[PDB]
Design a protein around this ligand. Structure first.
Ligand SMILES: *[C@@H]1O[C@H](CO)[C@@H](O[C@@H]2O[C@H](CO)[C@@H](O[C@@H]3O[C@H](CO[C@H]4O[C@H](CO)[C@@H](O)[C@H](O[C@H]5O[C@H](CO)[C@@H](O)[C@H](O)[C@@H]5O[C@H]5O[C@H](CO)[C@@H](O)[C@H](O)[C@@H]5O)[C@@H]4O)[C@@H](O)[C@H](O[C@H]4O[C@H](CO)[C@@H](O)[C@H](O)[C@@H]4O[C@H]4O[C@H](CO)[C@@H](O)[C@H](O)[C@@H]4O)[C@@H]3O)[C@H](O)[C@H]2NC(C)=O)[C@H](O)[C@H]1NC(C)=O
Ligand SMILES: O=C(c1ccc2[nH]nnc2c1)N1C[C@H]2CN(C(=O)c3cc(OCC(F)(F)F)c4ccccc4n3)C[C@@H]2C1
Ligand SMILES: [Ca+2]
Ligand SMILES: [Ca+2]
Ligand SMILES: [Cl-]
Ligand SMILES: [K+]
Ligand code: NA
Ligand SMILES: [Zn+2]
Length: 806
């Protein structure tokens, strides 16, 4: 109930919402059915349209009009946006040459440049190029301001997860909006697009920008707009708010457009019906910029033009049905569409088995257009697991497709031609970013970046301290003329030990053997030097990673590689080595096939042992520096040290061996040398963060040797590939991965074939940012380069996607 018999007189679009049952006059009252009886009459005036016409100029104020062309309108702050063009012979903003904005040019009393976020739903990245002829205002923003070719949304590439990621800098798993549709089993409650439950504040975690601003004394316009408020009215309202007195006027504002998404669903991303919606959005941008010019704010305000995701071609005939796989279809609940999430229909059903559901969905059809996963086995880059609202079972659906439970769900719900929600690396899901204003750079292109980064920058733009978030503060400094945030490197928490030869062979009882008893003064001084770090400048190009937590570990030097060896986890945290373009691959000589050698620098007590691997029928082992890439037959002995050993399922050894034997050489050829850092990852609670030792759920049988959930590598070379990796004078280039350490290759439907047919495809799928690996290992890379730190932070957030060109 609402006592809707009060009035909006003087209160239209009130900035502070009023407490029930007193009727509301804010831009959200419609959505709560709680507007005052006179809201439409007073606040949603439409009379005479939205533009001044020649004859309306210098008219007598008629308050009934939607906007005004009277002489007093400018000081009243309610002229139509084209008033000055028609009545004062001004030019439209789009027709003015653009001119660098070196400093904010603001009216007196403005304490900071305002921020206006112009958000456009379903605005696919390629619209910028493909729609450029019909979007002149947006094209001027783009070419005159700072722009990226595209911006990467978060997974799932749905509306609410992305808008709320924009507002908070958080992954959906952390902010809690993990889909447009959700079930929370602790609340026992459901969230949907239609309905009231989504208004309950308990769904929305973290700290969105409007709250960050408020708490720090910066006033905010309301970010949300009800559908029925026409775009023109949203603009005039923002402009009116900008005419408020200094003490009342907000500093941050948001406009939202339901277009082009709405049309894209109906007609497909490039349907001929899409030209119109794009024209119309441009015209809105035009009204804002004209309105700002009129208020002398066009060289004062920072404007962000930002999308939430793109749009793909998807039709009803491209639907996979779980009824063609599951005979038990009615005992599951499916969240359907461009992604799948599955749980049991009834928790009172003890015959529900996720394991057999997954198996019934694995590689069952030649061209199956979705892949089942347990959520902790999803590519780590999606960061889509650590929330009770995310179901254990997930389907990653191919672009262009849908998953549904039964055929009856589709024909009794072809309507749609476009949808979104797919993997956030998919080109068609990419969206847009432009920044224009005094704080952004002039005529600057920046590389693609992730929308999780924007919260930090919007905080910088407003002089706010951002709440803890998933952006990497400083990684977008190159977007800004000033207001930069100057981060410092995190302090190393643990310093390494540097052990010498401290143990005799006979102290080791590890059940290991090596045919290495096949034994000069010149070449023993030399090999001693190698063990003291003589070649370290070659294999450790960017300094040693810093350990950001409390632990006990050793630096181990070798001819061909350096490692940071954990006495706690009994294996390296990182292994670093450089492979020049000239490097030669060799094989493991027959006599050394099963060779594992004790490391006389490291006690038996802090070593792995071969016996445990012998007893563990499931677990085999591999090496982090690959024997195949040894620089000489004598250096190869080093690669068989028990301290270079890591536990690997035989299924994963196929992947790992192919990476080390074939792919590292290939990358070295193609990139003119590569530096590789590889290591283990333990994330048993799938929170994206390094596990402590008490979180490890699996060990090599009968031992304290913990099993990794993942193995990473970070592969660095020179951006200018005419320079070798080990002599690079400028910017770097990186690709990385976080491969899941799995006892089977079920994820790859082709795995029965040769590794050349499936391994690289699996690796690409599990591409990663260095930053993802930092979270997962507690390490900090690239400590010692000649590059600025901000550039290094950008590099650490880079993701190699393996998609073709936009
Ligand atoms: C992306 O960025 C984010 C933000 O920086 C990172 O997430 C943070 O990670 C922190 C470390 O894991 C985590 O810190 C913990 O906070 C606990 C209290 O947190 C509450 O208060 C904060 C501040 O206001 C609030 O933000 C939190 O909000 C969460 O929960 C609410 C309500 O449920 C949700 O609405 C909201 O969406 C959010 O949910 C998300 O996070 C929670 C975890 O908090 C997940 O479970 C959800 O799935 C979801 O993802 C909270 O309201 C605090 O209790 C923890 O302290 C424990 O551990 C420390 C170790 O330092 C120890 O000192 C204590 O003893 C304590 O242990 C006790 O509790 C244990 C568990 O109950 C128990 O086992 C023990 O026996 C002890 O009794 C901890 O400090 C922080 O909350 C989140 N913040 C957010 C916003 O998510 C994220 O890691 C980044 N991601 C990546 C990949 O880098
Ligand atoms: O009808 C839809 C819809 C649209 C596209 C779809 N595709 N498939 N199904 C769909 C259903 N709606 C109603 C829209 C109104 N709205 C906001 O007003 C908003 C603005 C924000 O910000 C706008 C800003 F980014 F500019 F700030 C937010 C920010 C954080 C959280 C929520 C926000 N909500 C978002 C809602 C999605
Ligand atoms: Ca959307
Ligand atoms: Ca973890
Ligand atoms: Cl969803
Ligand atoms: K074994
Ligand atoms: Na397989
Ligand atoms: Zn949509």
């Amino acid at each position: 109930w609402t006592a809707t018999s009060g009035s909006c007189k003087g209160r239209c679009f009130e900035l502070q919402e009023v407490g029930p049952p007193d009727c509301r006059c804010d831009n959200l009252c419609k959505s709560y059915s709680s507007c005052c009886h006179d809201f439409d009459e007073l606040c949603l005036k439409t009379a005479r349209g939205w533009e001044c016409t020649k004859d309306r100029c210098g008219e007598v104020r008629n308050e009934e009009n939607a906007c005004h062309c009277s002489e007093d309108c400018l000081s009243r702050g309610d002229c139509c946006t084209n008033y000055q063009v028609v009545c004062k012979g001004e030019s439209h903003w789009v027709d003015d040459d653009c001119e660098e904005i070196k400093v904010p040019e603001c009216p007196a009393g403005f304490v900071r440049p305002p921020l206006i976020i112009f958000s456009v739903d379903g605005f696919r990245a390629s619209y910028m190029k493909k729609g450029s002829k019909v979007m002149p205002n947006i094209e001027k923003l783009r070419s005159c301001g700072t722009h990226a070719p595209y911006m990467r949304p978060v997974y799932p590439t749905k509306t609410f997860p992305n808008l709320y990621t924009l507002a908070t800098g958080l992954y959906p798993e952390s902010h809690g909006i993990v889909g447009n549709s959700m079930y929370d089993p602790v609340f026992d409650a459901s969230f949907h697009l239609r309905g009231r439950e989504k208004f309950n504040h308990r769904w929305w975690g973290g700290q969105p920008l409007w709250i960050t601003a408020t708490k720090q004394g910066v006033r905010a316009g309301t970010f949300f707009w009800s559908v029925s408020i026409p775009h023109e009215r949203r603009i005039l309202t923002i402009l009116q708010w900008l005419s408020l007195p200094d003490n009342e006027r907000p500093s941050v504002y948001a406009f939202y457009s339901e277009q082009p998404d709405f049309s894209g669903h109906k007609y497909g991303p490039f349907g001929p019906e899409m030209t119109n919606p794009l024209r119309e959005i441009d015209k809105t941008v035009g009204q804002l910029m004209d309105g700002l010019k009129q208020l002398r704010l066009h060289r004062c305000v920072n404007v962000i033009f930002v999308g939430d995701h793109g749009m793909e071609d998807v039709t009803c005939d491209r639907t996979e049905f779980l009824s063609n796989y599951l005979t038990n279809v009615d005992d599951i609940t499916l969240v359907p569409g461009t992604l799948g999430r599955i749980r049991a229909k009834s928790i009172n059903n003890s015959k529900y088995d996720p394991k057999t559901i997954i198996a019934a969905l694995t590689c069952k059809k030649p061209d199956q257009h979705f892949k089942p996963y347990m959520k902790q086995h999803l590519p780590k880059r999606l960061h889509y697991a650590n929330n009770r609202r995310i179901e254990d079972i997930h389907l990653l659906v191919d672009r262009r497709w849908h998953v549904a439970r039964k055929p009856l769900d589709v024909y009794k719900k072809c309507f749609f031609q476009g949808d979104h929600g797919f993997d956030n690396k998919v080109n068609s899901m990419q969206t847009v970013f432009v920044g224009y204003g005094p704080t952004f750079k002039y005529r600057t292109k920046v590389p693609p970046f992730e929308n999780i980064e924007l919260y930090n920058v919007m905080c910088d733009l407003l002089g706010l301290k951002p709440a803890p978030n998933n952006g990497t503060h400083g990684s977008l400094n190159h977007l800004l003329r000033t207001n930069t945030f100057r981060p410092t490197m995190p302090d190393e928490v643990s310093r390494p030990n540097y052990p010498g030869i401290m143990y005799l062979q006979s102290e080791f009882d590890l059940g290991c053997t090596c045919d290495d008893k096949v034994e000069n003064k010149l070449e023993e001084l030399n090999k001693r030097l190698h063990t003291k770090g003589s070649t370290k400048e070659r294999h450790l190009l960017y300094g040693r990673p810093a350990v950001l937590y409390r632990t006990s570990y050793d630096i181990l030097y070798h001819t061909d590689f350096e490692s940071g060896y954990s006495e706690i986890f009994l294996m390296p945290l990182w292994t670093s080595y450089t492979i020049s373009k000239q490097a030669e691959v060799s094989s493991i000589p027959e006599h050394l096939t099963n060779c594992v050698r004790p490391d006389v620098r490291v006690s038996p007590g802090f070593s792995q042992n071969c016996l445990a691997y012998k007893n563990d029928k499931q677990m085999s082992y591999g090496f982090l520096f690959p024997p195949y890439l040894s620089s000489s037959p004598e250096a190869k002995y080093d690669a068989f040290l028990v301290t270079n050993m890591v536990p690997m399922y035989p299924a994963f050894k196929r992947v790992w061996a192919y990476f080390q034997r074939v792919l590292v050489k290939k990358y070295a050829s193609e990139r003119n040398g590569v530096n590789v850092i590889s290591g283990p990852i333990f994330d048993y609670n799938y929170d994206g963060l390094r596990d402590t030792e008490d979180e490890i759920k699996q060990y090599v049988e009968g031992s304290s040797i913990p099993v990794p959930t993942h193995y990473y590598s970070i592969i660095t070379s020179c951006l200018d590939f005419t320079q070798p990796a080990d002599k690079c004078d400028g910017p770097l280039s990186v690709s990385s991965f976080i491969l899941p350490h799995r006892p089977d290759n079920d994820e790859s439907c082709n795995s029965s074939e040769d590794e050349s047919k499936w391994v690289e495809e699996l690796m690409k799928m599990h591409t990663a940012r260095v930053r993802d690996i930092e979270h997962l290992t507690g390490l900090d890379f690239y400590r010692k380069t000649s590059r600025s730190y901000s550039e290094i932070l950008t590099l650490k957030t880079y993701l190699h996607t393996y998609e073709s060109e936009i």
